[PDB]
Write an enzyme that holds these catalytic residues in place. Sequence first.
Site, PDB file in Angstrom:
ATOM      1  N   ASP C  65      36.391  40.080  35.552  1.00 18.71           N
ATOM      2  CA  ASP C  65      35.768  39.626  36.786  1.00 18.71           C
ATOM      3  C   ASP C  65      35.370  38.160  36.663  1.00 18.71           C
ATOM      4  O   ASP C  65      34.700  37.765  35.704  1.00 18.71           O
ATOM      5  CB  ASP C  65      34.545  40.486  37.106  1.00 18.71           C
ATOM      6  CG  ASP C  65      33.936  40.167  38.462  1.00 18.71           C
ATOM      7  OD1 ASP C  65      34.508  39.340  39.203  1.00 18.71           O
ATOM      8  OD2 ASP C  65      32.880  40.747  38.785  1.00 18.71           O
ATOM      9  N   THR C  98      36.980  37.795  44.216  1.00 18.48           N
ATOM     10  CA  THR C  98      36.092  36.885  43.500  1.00 18.48           C
ATOM     11  C   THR C  98      36.879  35.789  42.792  1.00 18.48           C
ATOM     12  O   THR C  98      36.524  34.607  42.866  1.00 18.48           O
ATOM     13  CB  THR C  98      35.236  37.664  42.501  1.00 18.48           C
ATOM     14  OG1 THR C  98      34.435  38.624  43.203  1.00 18.48           O
ATOM     15  CG2 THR C  98      34.328  36.720  41.733  1.00 18.48           C
ATOM     16  N   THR C  99      37.950  36.164  42.090  1.00 17.32           N
ATOM     17  CA  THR C  99      38.767  35.171  41.403  1.00 17.32           C
ATOM     18  C   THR C  99      39.543  34.307  42.391  1.00 17.32           C
ATOM     19  O   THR C  99      39.759  33.115  42.137  1.00 17.32           O
ATOM     20  CB  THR C  99      39.721  35.863  40.428  1.00 17.32           C
ATOM     21  OG1 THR C  99      38.964  36.614  39.471  1.00 17.32           O
ATOM     22  CG2 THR C  99      40.575  34.844  39.688  1.00 17.32           C
ATOM     23  N   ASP C 404      33.902  47.308  40.938  1.00 16.08           N
ATOM     24  CA  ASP C 404      34.729  46.554  41.873  1.00 16.08           C
ATOM     25  C   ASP C 404      35.639  47.470  42.681  1.00 16.08           C
ATOM     26  O   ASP C 404      35.957  47.162  43.836  1.00 16.08           O
ATOM     27  CB  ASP C 404      35.557  45.510  41.123  1.00 16.08           C
ATOM     28  CG  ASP C 404      34.709  44.380  40.572  1.00 16.08           C
ATOM     29  OD1 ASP C 404      33.550  44.234  41.016  1.00 16.08           O
ATOM     30  OD2 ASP C 404      35.201  43.638  39.697  1.00 16.08           O
TER      31      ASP C 404
HETATM   32  N1  ADP Z   1      49.593  45.776  41.461  1.00 20.09           N
HETATM   33  C1  ADP Z   1      49.644  44.627  42.179  1.00 20.09           C
HETATM   34  N2  ADP Z   1      50.817  44.147  42.646  1.00 20.09           N
HETATM   35  C2  ADP Z   1      50.879  43.007  43.359  1.00 20.09           C
HETATM   36  N3  ADP Z   1      49.804  42.259  43.668  1.00 20.09           N
HETATM   37  C3  ADP Z   1      48.563  42.625  43.267  1.00 20.09           C
HETATM   38  C4  ADP Z   1      48.414  43.858  42.480  1.00 20.09           C
HETATM   39  N4  ADP Z   1      47.101  43.986  42.212  1.00 20.09           N
HETATM   40  C5  ADP Z   1      46.465  42.928  42.776  1.00 20.09           C
HETATM   41  N5  ADP Z   1      47.336  42.114  43.401  1.00 20.09           N
HETATM   42  C6  ADP Z   1      46.984  40.868  44.126  1.00 20.09           C
HETATM   43  O1  ADP Z   1      46.170  40.031  43.304  1.00 20.09           O
HETATM   44  C7  ADP Z   1      45.102  39.467  44.069  1.00 20.09           C
HETATM   45  C8  ADP Z   1      43.828  39.427  43.236  1.00 20.09           C
HETATM   46  O2  ADP Z   1      43.557  40.725  42.711  1.00 20.09           O
HETATM   47  P1  ADP Z   1      42.421  40.962  41.593  1.00 20.09           P
HETATM   48  O3  ADP Z   1      42.593  39.942  40.492  1.00 20.09           O
HETATM   49  O4  ADP Z   1      42.438  42.430  41.238  1.00 20.09           O
HETATM   50  O5  ADP Z   1      41.034  40.668  42.359  1.00 20.09           O
HETATM   51  P2  ADP Z   1      40.162  39.345  42.067  1.00 20.09           P
HETATM   52  O6  ADP Z   1      41.080  38.191  42.388  1.00 20.09           O
HETATM   53  O7  ADP Z   1      38.987  39.477  43.005  1.00 20.09           O
HETATM   54  O8  ADP Z   1      39.799  39.462  40.605  1.00 20.09           O
HETATM   55  C9  ADP Z   1      44.943  40.326  45.314  1.00 20.09           C
HETATM   56  O9  ADP Z   1      44.884  39.499  46.479  1.00 20.09           O
HETATM   57  C10 ADP Z   1      46.174  41.211  45.366  1.00 20.09           C
HETATM   58  O10 ADP Z   1      46.931  40.925  46.545  1.00 20.09           O
END
Ligand code: ADP
Lengths: 520, 527, 550
Positions: C65, C98-99, C404
């Site tokens: 996170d 968040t990221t 999350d």
């Molecule tokens: N299995 C997946 N396949 C393709 N895209 C993904 C997948 N999981 C997450 N994403 C993309 O990555 C982006 C960020 O996801 P994540 O890193 O889990 O949340 P955060 O950015 O808040 O840490 C999201 O906008 C999503 O569209």
Amino acid sequence: VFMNASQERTTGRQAQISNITAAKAVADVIRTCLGPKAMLKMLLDPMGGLVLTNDGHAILREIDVAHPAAKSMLELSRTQDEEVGDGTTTVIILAGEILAQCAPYLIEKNIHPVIIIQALKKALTDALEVIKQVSKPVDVENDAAMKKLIQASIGTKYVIHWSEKMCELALDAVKTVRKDFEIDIKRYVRVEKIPGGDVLDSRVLKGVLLNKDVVHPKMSRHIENPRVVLLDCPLEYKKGESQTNIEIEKEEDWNRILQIEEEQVQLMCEQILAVRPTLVITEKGVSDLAQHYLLKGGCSVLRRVKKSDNNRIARVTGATIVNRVEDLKESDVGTNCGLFKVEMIGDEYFSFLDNCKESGLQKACTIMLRGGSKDILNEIDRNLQDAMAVARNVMLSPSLSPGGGATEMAVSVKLAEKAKQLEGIQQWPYQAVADAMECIPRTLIQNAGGDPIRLLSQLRAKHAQGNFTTGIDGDKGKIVDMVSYGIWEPEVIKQQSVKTAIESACLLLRVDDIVSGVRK
Amino acid sequence: MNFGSQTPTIVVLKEGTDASQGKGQIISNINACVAVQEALKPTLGPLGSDILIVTSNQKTTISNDGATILKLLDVVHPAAKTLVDISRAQDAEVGDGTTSVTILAGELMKEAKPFLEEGISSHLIMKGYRKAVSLAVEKINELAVDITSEKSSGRELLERCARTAMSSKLIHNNADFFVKMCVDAVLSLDRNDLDDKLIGIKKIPGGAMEESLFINGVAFKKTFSYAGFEQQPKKFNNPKILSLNVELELKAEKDNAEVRVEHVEDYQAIVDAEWQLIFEKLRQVEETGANIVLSKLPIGDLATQFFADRNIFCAGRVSADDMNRVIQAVGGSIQSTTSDIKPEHLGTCALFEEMQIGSERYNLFQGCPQAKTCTLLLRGGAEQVIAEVERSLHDAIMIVKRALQNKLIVAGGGATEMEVSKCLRDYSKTIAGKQQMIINAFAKALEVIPRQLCENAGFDAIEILNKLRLAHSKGEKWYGVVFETENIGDNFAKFVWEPALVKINALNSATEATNLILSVDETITNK
Amino acid sequence: MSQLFNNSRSDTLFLGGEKISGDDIRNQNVLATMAVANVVKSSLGPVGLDKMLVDDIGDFTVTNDGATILSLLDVQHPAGKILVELAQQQDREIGDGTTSVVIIASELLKRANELVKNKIHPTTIITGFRVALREAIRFINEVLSTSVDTLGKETLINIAKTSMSSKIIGADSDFFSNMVVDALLAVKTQNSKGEIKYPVKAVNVLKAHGKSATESLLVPGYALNCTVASQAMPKRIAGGNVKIACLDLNLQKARMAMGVQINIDDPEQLEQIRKREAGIVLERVKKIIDAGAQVVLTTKGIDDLCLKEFVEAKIMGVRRCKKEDLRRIARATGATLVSSMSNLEGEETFESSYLGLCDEVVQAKFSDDECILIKGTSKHSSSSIILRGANDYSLDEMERSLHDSLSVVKRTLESGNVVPGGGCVEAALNIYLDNFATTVGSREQLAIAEFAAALLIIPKTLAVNAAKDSSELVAKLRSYHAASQMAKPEDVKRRSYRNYGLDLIRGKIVDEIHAGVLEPTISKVKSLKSALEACVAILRIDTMITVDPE
Ligand SMILES: Nc1ncnc2c1ncn2[C@@H]1O[C@H](COP(=O)(O)OP(=O)(O)O)[C@@H](O)[C@H]1O
Ligand SMILES: Nc1ncnc2c1ncn2[C@@H]1O[C@H](COP(=O)(O)OP(=O)(O)O)[C@@H](O)[C@H]1O
Ligand SMILES: Nc1ncnc2c1ncn2[C@@H]1O[C@H](COP(=O)(O)OP(=O)(O)O)[C@@H](O)[C@H]1O
Ligand SMILES: [Mg+2]
Ligand SMILES: [Mg+2]
Ligand SMILES: [Mg+2]
């Protein structure tokens, strides 16, 4: 400057290389601690004591290792101990080799870690099925079968000379604590040790061993049928939560204050004499005035007792802890006490409480141990905790896994066969798991002094044709079968070794960068 | 088995060596070149501003061009030294555009920043620059028009090209008088052999810049002026210039010679012998009729005493670089033997006069129509203005120096960079690959030169570039920004011209400087 | 990128640190922005990798996170605290993105700073971002997809797997998907006269390291972490309709109010006064035992004085627990939390309505830790999740990984409209803003065109962490999306594209609907609004003034 950050930031592939090299050094220290011929490691604590043991759990616990990745390997020692208690050294050696054997790549192939992790999850599922197929169930009601099972963890320890005597102590301790499913716990098992003596003279005695002599010379030290009543309240005069602040107008009122303090304690002693207990145990301190009226009726007074010992006394004699003296009844009085005696030893006195042995609450028992010194006692105590923990797995899980390195080698053979059938991009991470499983039986050869090239080559060939019970002999360093070898190990120990090692390797592969000393 | 106690691990590299690898090292190398570029951005353009730099010795030096600016500061970071090499290579080879080369070299690294943040490694990025630099050079040769096609005059050709380099300097307002000097300076030199040592400018503190003069002769200044000076006439009609490499002295620099005389009468002969040996070389000079005697080595007292009665002027201790400049205009060349001097080795001139400026006296050779050399005497209030105008005329003479070898008309003021950039965009549309975004970034990186032109002028650079791309849509050339009229238009009608060696070397140096740093992903510094 | 520092002028004097003005502030703002940005770039996406931070005491923290990573980083730069507090604002409100919001706001500052040097005014740059954002939100409403013709919970199962990716639970996300969906549906309550809301953190997270993570059991009820007061109490309650008593009243020997001073003229009164001190507490516990309460919960510690009657009556005693944990136990079982025991009448009494109801109350021992498992609640259902891992540091990451996932599913049932994830929206907003601003043009066209390319940092960063070719995937995302923007809503084909792309696992362009990766529309909105305010606040700062501390 900016924030708290930078200095030398390790980035790229060298950050994962430092995580593999540091974690590999953890298993290299206890690498000689595996096997029946395993050596010992003497540890020096900052407190000034000494810890000498071959168990990887106690070795990695006291050693202070400063490193982000290498400390994660130290946490795996308590994972095997608290859940099971046996196999702590195997998990660290296996998890240390998995990280090195399953991921030499990304230094070469540049394979993404998650791609390897996806293969580790499928390799863990197939590894559990292989262990279930090579596991033959064993009867838990056979005393002769449980003795050879406890000797599994004993064969690698120093108590193997007393193993014939040690299995008598471990079997009676687990069977007594077992309550009818069949859930037992070591919080009621007493680790108390006796300095000096002969190991053969040590025996498990029912009841609680107290270090305190009788308070008064007229207290009987020999009682045929002791009756024990536990009191949490002190026999002294309670001052109260609020100050009394007696205002004494006349000179006759002050003498009555000190006169009631004698009669008030006497009133609490008369209520105790209603059940005429032979032995009275008080958690807190006792006044010298209260012991006289208890001695007149036959009650026995003892020193203040810790809360941990009060719970074990109530289980042996069936007594119920009674705080309020006015509410004391004959139903809460402990009975069926075999013997009450006090033996003289130069260090301290010792009070014995014997059980009449004849469903209800689980019984409590203490384990007396006679060693050659104070540090030898601590080594056998760690050996008993490892030996008695084996009997807990067979009762909850009657399944019995192959020992002597046969479990890890049986998985490595099945992973190599399915590696060519899987193909795909995951074939390299999946096949590399089998190379890390054969390192545990390879350590048995290096400690025995044999040639691991010729022995492991014939071990894999005789595994398919001969049987799944073929393994490495510890003493002779030869190829033998666990059927004729006579020693086996529960499946729970092998399942915790495969799961904990693989789940921990996935955590270190996801590390990108490392920043030290950010803030507190 | 171990020796004793515990053995610490041995670090591979020596302790204290800074080594870092990966994409983070290249970004740190690019930011080192961009930080150096930030100082040279406002300097680009005729409205650019000078930079004041003080070194550790508290020596004040003011230079507008980026060649000398990088020489004053001591550069540490390796990637920042690359911008220094291209500035010194552009200065020595041509001397014009030394600032623009650094702007282009750093802009290519700036446009490669979003490409490195992607998954594209630096090896494929250099391939687009190496392919685009080959086509950009071929476009400049196609936009060059021969001057002999219109059958114009050769003197007016060097005048319009010289006024272009006068921009951004202090000469821009005074360029009327100053351009007429350097143009006449290159015409004195031989068209086959052009030399930068003969055009060397003396620094004379004080005076006014518009008070400068240009004469085909030379000035060797003075050193000592021994006994017998200031009596000799400083104004000659038709003097005969003589030069001597032999030193005139009485037993001074000659090695020690032990003289042993066993007689008293023979001792009187050796005393008068030295008087005869010195006066013999002096008598042979008068027989030739030379009214001016020059020498690299010092001149003795008896020499100046001999020429004092004969009015012949003599000045010694002249540097070798000055004497080599004198021997060209005086015809015949130095004869170091007084007895071997022949009449054809002597020089001449129409007029000779020695005048004093800035509390310093200078011997000026005048009236030399056959002189192949030239001199430039610059003045000014500050001593830093003189060093700036000297370096301003130095780069200005290099314009007319390289123009006589090859005559090519190339647009300037942002007109060339905008025309080449559009030809690269039409070629990038047919690539359909990774090079499509690199060539479009290379063509966009060439627009940085017109950027600082409008930014330093106060006008917005967004509206100008929009008017360019709409104008460059139809076929156009020389079309660029004009500072005087405030509107952008054809520079060919403005007569501002630039040589072809400035634009060709700017594209080859910027590409070579960019591909060198992008090919280094790790930097190791010992000690 | 700042060299030579700055020359201190004597004509300009201010107490404290020196005052820096000009382009140096905006150059240091981006330099401080790229410092915290490069930390979360490698942690973004399923192919991303997290980082480790040492606490100087030997303990570390492993989490993917971006909020926790930035929270552990104390930034001394004034403008750097905005992006740090932006992550703490992102997970607190939406709980996702968040990221991304840190990386989006970082590229907005990098491109705008390059525009300020272009001589366009920052307010014109800000105007271009706000006008483009107003139309970008309208495009998000056009791409909304309402769940229809879906079988069972597959809608929430596929969305929950998106948040589980990029984290240690991503490999186990197949098993953990059914645990998260069933956890928030059991805590379902009603408020605002018909509005459905869900509590946050209501699902208890217990940490016991052992076995494997795939074997984590989902308890059909709430679980409380506490140790039993007396070991002689039964750890298992047999029979249904178990009565639970939630009480804030401790049972202990207590001092009388400090405003009271006892003065007695007779020694005979010392026996009754000392006995009554313990007797006052007996009146409260006696009426509770007579009601047949099997389990008695207490907020504060209980002395051994009153624990004797619990053993004889076979009542299980409880000691200090979190105050917020005992509220959901009484609500689930039907009990009423009593802060102080009293009745409307001036006499003490106990009503049976204050006792809860459930199927059973058992205490299970996970490893060496013992916790109470309450299953089969009566009034309202509940749930709990016990996370299992190799070490406690992995359990610390799985907690934030589970927390999350609860926030993404929470925002899913509040708004039925969802949008496809995996860089599909960031690639769709690029082309939509490319054709935009072409009508207005003039000066604002440049600031809006850079805002469209600023959203491209998210899809390009995902391909870098996968060790693949980014230019191959980005060129495809621009190919399918651009040509389909002009489509007319008949003859079909056309818009069937542009709805999918950027699959990091296989490196190919596949449909996100069949893949299952989806994101709630709430996570997309308010993420650019918060990133805009972080960009506007930093961009408007010409001069930074630092005052030395006293
Ligand atoms: N299995 C997946 N396949 C393709 N895209 C993904 C997948 N999981 C997450 N994403 C993309 O990555 C982006 C960020 O996801 P994540 O890193 O889990 O949340 P955060 O950015 O808040 O840490 C999201 O906008 C999503 O569209
Ligand atoms: N006598 C023996 N011969 C061969 N292998 C043995 C022998 N005893 C133990 N092993 C192997 O060593 C492993 C660890 O056993 P043990 O040393 O008792 O536990 P720990 O390694 O935790 O101390 C087991 O998996 C078993 O296969
Ligand atoms: N009269 C002019 N009109 C328009 N542009 C000019 C003019 N003179 C010079 N420039 C432009 O200004 C830039 C800088 O020129 P200058 O500073 O004089 O020398 P250098 O190119 O060596 O820095 C050149 O690239 C040229 O194109
Ligand atoms: Mg063992
Ligand atoms: Mg110039
Ligand atoms: Mg997420």
